[PDB]
């Protein structure tokens with residue numbers, strides 16, 4: 001069935017959606033990230049990272065501190081429920097995670113951790 005979604009990050013520092021719905025009948029969910037545009041990873045790299053709303057800021061801040069060589073994400077970050085690699089234009093990456101990780105009474109957010117991008121590149125991921 002449909003327990004997957006295609007997300008795009010472009011040269012204008014924007015995702016093509018700020019809301020993803022995960023049907024409760026899904027046991028696992030897949031996000032397929034692509035990067036239309038022409039800019040390379042260093043100027044406009046994008047990733048897809050999922051965490052609780054409360055942990056978002058910490059994940060973003062520590063991600064920047066980790067550096068481009070670590071795809072701007074702190075290694076073994078226990079706050080990260082799902083993540084794709086950092087990609088440049090023309091590249092792609094997919095990630096699958098267990099829906100059981102979406103704890104009851106928690107609001108999940110998806111965002112890009114490349115320095116400054118989360119200002120525009122964010123969205124809600126809700127289970128229903």
Ligand SMILES: [Cu+2]
Pocket residue numbers: 009044045046047112113114117121
């Ligand atoms: Cu980005």
